[PDB]
Symmetry: D2
């Protein structure tokens, strides 16, 4: 699937309809993807991953920092399947940050393994493209990419992940570990920043 | 607020994008309100209830059968506030079914919890029965309120979602007792209406 | 197999957990943490589906005490149903028990005929009540009848009835919380707990 | 608080009482600390953290890899606290791996003037935290506190005691809830003890 498609004209939700940290009350325009909706979509994603990679060991690779929540929740849903079914995905985990791969184990530890890369968002797709080329050089058995969000943009290089949560309009989103200058990671909903939020936390 | 307003032209979601029970695969048309969205909205409602009833004992009254999931979940979010704040709503619980002695409501603060209000006629009827026992105060929370010209004009104190006049199931709402065991609120398909018809 | 809680189980200091402010002086110890109940319930759900998953299930909640266990147990069953190949519809009903045993507020028990009936209870103590309800239910020729009880007490007062599915086997001590009450109080408490002497006097009828 | 004290002769739980990953059925001996108990304790820890640290911008530092589950859950509870009142403070997050060499984080200067919460899976000898602390303090945080899910009772202790402690456990080797044995057992919700067969099967 292209994932859950959010139209260009979608108005999102009034902030007053949800519980939102008071320190961000004036910094956000609307709620765009409620936390619980992300969870519902992530549950179905876990099952799709189980379908595609079930019955083989997986190395789950989290692209920090923005991927951390999606990673934890996706792995939690996969673990729920592992313990309530007879078929399993034994998993190990690693974490990288992109500058240039920062931290993480030797990429040679990926050689001959089934790798699931977990990302928060694909915009141009250039970054994931570059990451994939690099990882491929270490001869993994298989590599798939799960991304919570994919942006509809004319700047799109044309990269499509294997698993996508939501396909969104070309708007700058924050929340659910996605940040603006390190802020808004502590917000469980995906939201659009307000003009005052951009000005307040501007680098 | 009127709650989360869902438009007449809301398309809903393709079933294929969510986890749904196999035995209903052919019987639903779209998912209308995702379980998680319901939880998010319910978390805010619990804070609204606390703001309005916060300093007092309440009797939480569940209207069975459809109100059972919303009731459990709303009370769970209230309890979360009760144990993480110095503000507290002590609660007792009661159940009733429409289609304990209400005397126990005399002089009490009562929160009635309902799955859905359509015409409002059922709730007005329930309210007139409760008021016969002279409660101290009565507030009503409904997960769903229908936008419909058939409404008698009754509006609840707390509303989750305001929806189009469409027949919905799931999250404990049924069609002939079926579809209660569905976490999402959904719109039933033609084959489902026929399969499960009385 | 039930989790066995020993006679000498000391439980946990209240200050190690989050508990409702209005009950701070009213409880003695946390006996069974909420999280633990959830973990055990997850596994009970699976046991239930393994045994009953083969035919339409009617889940009967015994109010009021059964309501929390019922909701959570059904949530775990639903999670199973939506992440698996095969699935069966479940319908639900709710009943209260009253001595003249008399069943209040359910559907016609003829709805039970030919069905896999799952009765969901908070606690079995002497078990006289469940033993009576079962005899009743069996008049309507259910395909199958099984009982799930969050708690079962080790008590010399037992008539010898044991449920099919048990969360925890506990000592002969009065417990409250997770919808179990003392004079209607303590239902709004997530953990299973023991009441303090001040709690007993405050809420005594 | 010393946290929830688990005795030397605590027997933990038979695996059959819980749902356990199919692939570890032979590799564990007992469940030691059920996932749910960890969550209940973590919720209370979150409240204690906000009570001490909630007055100023908090930077939460996750010590990878084993601290990742405790970190995600602890922060979720903290976020829940911050959205159910009108009083809250911003929190930012960082992730480090420990080699006195800190791998993969932001410049430590980003800690200057902040309330820093270091989140760890377990303290044993305590040598790692003490060394980490000695470094972090040289960046003049407004305050530095450490939350650790587990703290071991051991005569090998350097005498370090964290500020927030989930559980105080015996000197036993445990896995689960992101704690590993040679990278295995991270994908397990409960804290458990390995079996003899598990230890030989996954030995490095
Ligand atoms: N937080 C956020 N929200 C967006 O809507 C958004 N749209 C694009 N991007 C850039 C994204 C990812 O886009 C990268 P690419 O165009 O796919 O190569 C975050 O990148 C990491 P940073 O070094 O800026 O912190 C976004 N980041
Ligand atoms: N399941 C369901 N879905 C609806 O969209 C819907 N819209 C209205 N109604 C009737 C609703 C509530 O509307 C009642 P009212 O017109 O406000 O008095 C509840 O169903 C109770 P019953 O028919 O099982 O006895 C609905 N019921
Ligand atoms: N709340 C509670 N805690 C107990 O430890 C306990 N042990 C036994 N019981 C009596 C319980 C359960 O045991 C009944 P039985 O002896 O198995 O028929 C009934 O609760 C109904 P009521 O008291 O609101 O009328 C208990 N009730
Ligand atoms: N998984 C695990 N279980 C334990 O019971 C346990 N007890 C101590 N340790 C070592 C712990 C604690 O060591 C830090 P310190 O002794 O407090 O200075 C960290 O393990 C990291 P690594 O060996 O993968 O590099 C443990 N690790
Ligand atoms: Mg990213
Ligand atoms: Mg960024
Ligand atoms: Mg109703
Ligand atoms: Mg109905
Ligand atoms: Mg009972
Ligand atoms: Mg009672
Ligand atoms: Mg560590
Ligand atoms: Mg390790």
């Amino acid at each position: 699937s292209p994932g859950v498609v959010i139209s260009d004209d979608e108005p999102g939700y009034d902030l007053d309809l949800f519980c939102i940290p008071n320190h961000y009350a004036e910094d956000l325009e609307r709620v765009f993807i409620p936390h619980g909706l992300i969870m519902d979509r992530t549950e179905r994603l876990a099952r799709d991953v189980m379908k595609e990679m079930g019955g083989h060991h997986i190395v789950a690779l989290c692209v920090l920092k923005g991927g951390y929540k999606f990673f934890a929740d996706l792995l939690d849903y996969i673990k729920a399947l592992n313990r309530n079914s007879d078929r399993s995905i034994p998993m190990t985990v690693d974490f990288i940050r992109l500058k240039k791969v920062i931290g993480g184990d030797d990429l040679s530890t990926l050689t001959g393994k089934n790798v699931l890369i977990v990302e928060d968002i694909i915009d141009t797709g250039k970054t994931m493209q570059t990451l994939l080329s690099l990882v491929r050089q270490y001869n993994p058995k298989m590599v798939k990419v799960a991304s919570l969000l994919v942006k509809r943009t004319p700047r799109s290089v044309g990269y499509k992940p294997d698993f996508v949560g939501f396909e969104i309009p070309d708007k700058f989103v924050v929340g659910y570990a996605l940040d603006y200058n390190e802020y808004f990671r502590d917000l469980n909903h995906v939201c659009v920043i307000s003009e005052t939020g951009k000005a307040k936390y501007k680098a």
